[PDB]
Symmetry: D2
Subunit: 323 residues, 4 copies
């Protein structure tokens, strides 16, 4: 149908009978994403190196400033939570709208020096309180998400987006400057053949994780072992899980007893995308989306992917937790 | 000094007192790399999806055709070996020059659908025979390399290049259309803290590999376990090894008794780069660069990286091989 | 505050309390423009020249881009293009209420010299019945939105929806048009005249007399400067931003004039008048001409209102 | 076969048996041009307009790009720029044998209207001593290489090193200039004249008479067409590719003419003559003018040789 993300998002807003407020917020985020893609790809690098006679922190700050300014100037927001800011950012009264956005503007930027795929992750909620906006409006369960997505700056730039009717994939055509729809209503495989986690924490794994990893490598059913992949950049690993199937894990371990990854702006957004595509996303003890947030930078364990694989992991957890 | 790869390569050719033949071959390869970067990033995708009213195999073929045509039309080549062609490609007599090029035009393209970082790898030799050019001119030991490099199409596009005086790193500024020098004479750390291999082959590992992996996760020296990373795209994993240190392994295993990766156009080029940067690259039994090629698509085991780490692995190999 | 043309257009649609149909049509046109800009700047040329082993092709491509984008908007019923003999009636399934007249790549006969070139469009609401060519034959007064893209040293769009003219520049690093000037107004009187004086031999007495007044003023003022790119969007845009006058009048060899009413003259007239200028055939304001045929030609004189009025005073004076 | 300007320039340097010094200088200029093109097309404009929270700036940027790239080539000793009062003497450490005269962004006074604009350059071998402004004051006959970049609907470079004129187009998707025409030749006689007729009141008798012959021919031929962009590289390029004549003669108000000898007139003269055309002050071929000062102005008439000769016949006829 609509070819471009811009038309697609407009048309979905029309079908939803929206007033245009979420459409503007979505357009704003996606413009920030284009601006980030351009910087990640190093447009203007020659000027930094003295072409006219004249780094990861800078790109983190820039990416964060793109997202904040684009979202605030949309007139659709009241509260923003960023991975880069300690406190919630309350939108000026004059520019205040309905929505709350939790985002990680440039996830993986610590490893930009090796040119690892990196990404931007976001989740959007409606403010449901009647009182003045505060960080509390950001502390909603992931079940309350109105829309969420991620951009992956990989070999090409892609956006995964859901507004509650499945997951759609769009790719940036840089010669045109627009995202183009490449797959509508993507569904994750019921069972995959890839497992994705940092095995350098094997020494610190719980009994469940140790058992599950052993069976990936040494199956007891006569099947071939699963392949391993782990980029170390969440968006890259989660996106491969979506398109190829299998499992991605960052469980609690002895040194990170609450996991590493952040509930509000990493794990909730990807849990929503993955469930929208027919997969599962769990902490090990409940769905990620059912965790009731206590603090805006809260960490949780994360296990997600193909439902048969996530079920297998959960079985290890229950078994090893039982008397 | 020279800022751009183009000036840098010209100036190195001048210092070497070359006739310009290798400079033209290098310029030609780097132009093909720019053209590949553009396609990998999906310029013109909107036209494929019907913007004017009207895939991995296609990009493989395109990338291969860019490299071949650019190299042949340079007038610097006599024989080319590509990962994509069964037989060696003999340059037409009218266009024949001195050099032989072994290349993998788009390494990792099988996994382009998940937007994994991918790359282009090449090694250049001088034809030393007096007889008519043939695949034999491509069967030289890696010790005979005149120049080699790789392009990584990651979050940004980078080229690593060596012509025998260390490794230089260049990044593509897309707004300018030139590669810019970002690090001259890069040296790999003597010891790192990352190990990189597919642990899904644990069931098939030799005793050496099993022992080495166990000590990465469970050290016997009171140190923290190494972190694990494995993108599954060789250029991405090798480049991270270079900039961050540590070890990358694709050893022989029970199902791939000669390894997986290709001697001529994957392993020799990266072995050369890694040794030029002060690391080690071994098959497990000898340096990669000392392997005497028997066939243009020969596979070898590959272990490379920081010298203290590669030494530790080699120690496991010797110990487990001994009576 | 909206910065981008996409947010600007969306916000104006929310203010109009529109259903989103025109907004989608404008988004579609603008996407076509960005695609045309990329092609005009010769993205992918190395592939044409055999790296992996034209003016007609680009006319056809640009026409196909605009047609496809407009039809797939679901907002159109009838299109008129400079490139097509007949009006294009949108398939029933994709039908909406708007009629678009456009020239997808004006000035392309001369691409060879790399002259600035452009895309020109006017949008009408269908009034009635069952769609046909007649729906495209409304006078310019009935325009709902119009503008142009100029592919010059940078790519710019001039757009009006009835509340003045806004200017947007394409940032090719972003892929978005950025608002650079809101509510632009033409100077009351300028210091530049613009016409092909190579047709002097064929001018009417009024044009001859006016041109002579520009070069040899009688009131002690400095003579006007001359500029004529020969590409209509470049010459019209310069007149908008610096002021003065632009003329392609009737002459002995082109008695109806050269420029096309539906997709050249009406759109630029609308923009120039929205900016406080005048646009006339020498008989009538362009926007009041009732069109007789989709590829009809008219004379065109437009620009700063005091300069156009001085010209009309010469036309009226020499009439008998 | 070489396809790219980088390979083309390299191969011509290998054929010349050069040491690589001029080749490096040309690579440096061309890189400056690509950088200027990106800026002119407004890459990064959204950042200027506050996305993350001008004509002078672009003149200065373009001048800095060219100066830096040329100086860091290690191929230059003296530079003359339109933007700098005095010649720039290259630091001893970076010194080479070439002298470059350039206008980094010609036409930029009028960026506002998005007119085509350009970069113009001429390269000389220093003859002697110890570098100074005098090294830049050689006549155009001594040029080793020259050309221009036009930032029009696409970005093009015209380059000659003494063996004719080759044309290259920038493919912005690749970041490389692609050879589009080798050894271009201007038509012997064209059908377009190009000058600002707004200075008619100040023309000499020869110019007045010539312009009248163009509009009112006596031999039954069709009158010439008029084009005048007001941006020198756009008007000169069109004359190269379509033929005819381009004039900025002396007039009462500009008795020395307007255009600058070292970095506007000599470079385009060289290209036009390399292409089989003529370039004259009306007194002398431009390339034979011995320069008196680095920012000196001269009259300029250039183009198809038969049109320039018809003009010179009017100059000589009206001399007394
Ligand atoms: N562009 C869109 N795509 C999908 N759903 C939308 C869109 N716009 C609005 N909606 C739905 O309508 C609700 C109200 O929209 P709004 O009136 O724009 O705040 C949102 O919270 C969404 O659930
Ligand atoms: N651009 C360059 N950079 C580094 N070394 C070069 C370059 N050009 C030539 N050489 C060296 O000189 C040898 C002969 O160059 P050629 O005469 O160009 O075939 C090469 O095989 C290189 O070892
Ligand atoms: N994006 C927009 N910008 C300015 N005016 C608009 C916009 N959308 C709609 N309008 C006005 O509202 C009318 C109806 O809009 P629509 O319901 O989309 O056909 C149009 O014909 C315009 O006059
Ligand atoms: N790239 C080139 N293209 C054409 N002619 C060249 C080139 N390089 C050098 N030449 C000619 O050879 C001379 C000496 O070159 P160089 O040794 O580089 O200063 C120049 O002044 C030119 O006349
Ligand atoms: O090195 P570890 O501890 O395995 O961390 C990797 C994780 O941390 C990040 O926040 C850092 O890149 C995620 O993108 C990723 O999943
Ligand atoms: O899935 P496995 O067997 O671990 O293969 C990965 C290797 O194979 C490739 O040829 C395929 O991407 C290399 O780029 C990479 O190192
Ligand atoms: O050669 P002339 O007759 O002066 O034509 C110029 C006009 O023609 C065009 O349609 C281009 O050929 C317009 O863009 C321009 O104003
Ligand atoms: O306004 P005029 O006097 O006709 O000036 C036009 C000339 O001036 C310029 O230097 C630009 O202002 C040239 O690019 C052009 O040919």
């Amino acid at each position: 149908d609509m070819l471009t993300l811009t038309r697609y998002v407009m048309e979905k807003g029309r079908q939803a009978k929206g007033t245009g407020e979420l459409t503007q917020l979505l357009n704003s985020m996606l413009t920030a994403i284009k601006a980030i893609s351009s910087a990640v790809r190093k447009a203007g690098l020659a000027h930094l190196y003295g072409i006219a006679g004249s780094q990861v922190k800078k790109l983190d700050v820039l990416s964060n400033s793109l997202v904040i300014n684009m979202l605030q100037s949309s007139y659709s927001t009241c509260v923003l939570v960023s991975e880069e800011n300690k406190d919630a950012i309350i939108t000026a009264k004059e520019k205040r709208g309905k929505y709350v956005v939790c985002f990680d503007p440039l996830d993986g930027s610590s490893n930009i020096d090796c040119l690892a795929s990196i990404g931007t992750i976001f989740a959007i909620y409606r403010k449901t309180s009647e009182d003045e906006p505060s960080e509390k409006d950001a502390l909603q369960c992931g079940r309350n998400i109105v829309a969420a997505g991620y951009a992956l700056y990989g070999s090409a730039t892609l956006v995964a987006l859901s507004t509650g009717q499945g997951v759609d994939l769009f790719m940036l055509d840089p010669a045109l400057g627009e995202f183009v729809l490449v797959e509508k209503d993507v569904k994750i495989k019921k069972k995959g053949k890839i497992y994705s986690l940092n095995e350098g924490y094997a020494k610190y794994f719980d009994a469940a994780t140790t058992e599950y990893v052993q069976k990936k490598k040494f199956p007891e059913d006569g099947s071939a072992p699963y392949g391993a992949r782990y980029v170390g950049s969440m968006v890259a690993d989660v996106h491969r899980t979506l398109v190829y199937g299998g499992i991605f894990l960052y469980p609690a371990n002895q040194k990170s007893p609450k996991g590493k990854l952040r509930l509000l702006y990493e794990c909730n957004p990807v849990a929503y995308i993955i469930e929208q595509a027919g997969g599962l996303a769990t902490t090990g003890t409940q769905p990620v989306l059912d965790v009731k947030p206590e603090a805006i930078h809260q960490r949780v364990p994360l296990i997600l992917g193909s439902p048969e694989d996530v079920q297998e992991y959960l079985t290890c957890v229950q078994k090893n937790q039982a008397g």
